[PDB]
From Swiss-Prot:
Domain of life: Eukaryota
Keyword terms, alphabetized: Acetylation, Cell membrane, Cytoplasm, Membrane, Nucleus, Phosphoprotein, Wnt signaling pathway
Principal location listed in the UniProt entry: cytoplasm
Summary of the tissues where the protein is detected: Ubiquitous. Detected in brain, heart, kidney, lung, small intestine and skeletal muscle. Detected in various cell lines including HeLa. Weakly expressed in peripheral blood leukocytes.
GO molecular-function term, one example from the UniProt record: beta-catenin binding
Record's GO cellular component terms: actin cytoskeleton; cytoplasm; cytosol; extracellular exosome; fibrillar center; intracellular membrane-bounded organelle; plasma membrane
GO biological process: negative regulation of cell population proliferation; negative regulation of protein localization to cell surface; negative regulation of Wnt signaling pathway; regulation of Cdc42 protein signal transduction; Rho protein signal transduction; Wnt signaling pathway
Lineage start: Eukaryota, Metazoa, Chordata, Craniata, Vertebrata
Membrane topology: Peripheral membrane protein
Function of the molecule: May regulate a number of protein-protein interactions by competing for PDZ domain binding sites. Binds CTNNB1 and may thereby act as an inhibitor of the Wnt signaling pathway. Competes with LIN7A for KCNJ4 binding, and thereby promotes KCNJ4 internalization. May play a role in the Rho signaling pathway. May play a role in activation of CDC42 by the viral protein HPV16 E6.
Name of the protein: Tax1-binding protein 3
Residues found modified as Phosphoserine: S61
Gene3D superfamilies (alphabetical): 2.30.42.10
Gene from which the chain derives: TAX1BP3
Length: 124
């Protein structure tokens, strides 16, 4: 069977759709990231989960398109605006997801906001 999404079993990949958010005098997608492969999972807030790294949200919009649509903090973005956000540096990701040129983007995050997964890190 030709499965089109990228959901395995435990993690669910879900789509997000951020519409243009004007913050002050900039245009932002609302959310912020922590970084992907350019970061060290041995000391990362949301990459302590997967050593496979990837760009994840560290903050979303305080009340904007990110949280409005369905983008949550911690959720790793694997797909942004048909560009694939999987395996990209913080720098390159920033210059795509928080760039001010684009208004609305079709994103896909893999919910890592799970349980049983995401090793305790002595916090759990």
């Amino acid at each position: 069977g030709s499965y089109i999404p990228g959901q395995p079993v435990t993690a669910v990949v879900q789509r997000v759709e951020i519409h243009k958010l004007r913050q002050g005098e900039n245009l932002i997608l609302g959310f912020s990231i922590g970084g992907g492969i350019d970061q060290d999972p041995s000391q990362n807030p949301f990459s302590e989960d997967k050593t496979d790294k990837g760009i994840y949200v560290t903050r979303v919009s305080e009340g904007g398109p990110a949280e409005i649509a369905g983008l949550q903090i911690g959720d790793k973005i694997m797909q942004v605006n048909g560009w694939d956000m999987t395996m990209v540096t913080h720098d390159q990701a920033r210059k795509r997801l928080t760039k001010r040129s684009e208004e609305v983007v079709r994103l896909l995050v893999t919910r890592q906001s799970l349980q049983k997964a995401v090793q305790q890190s002595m916090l759990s």
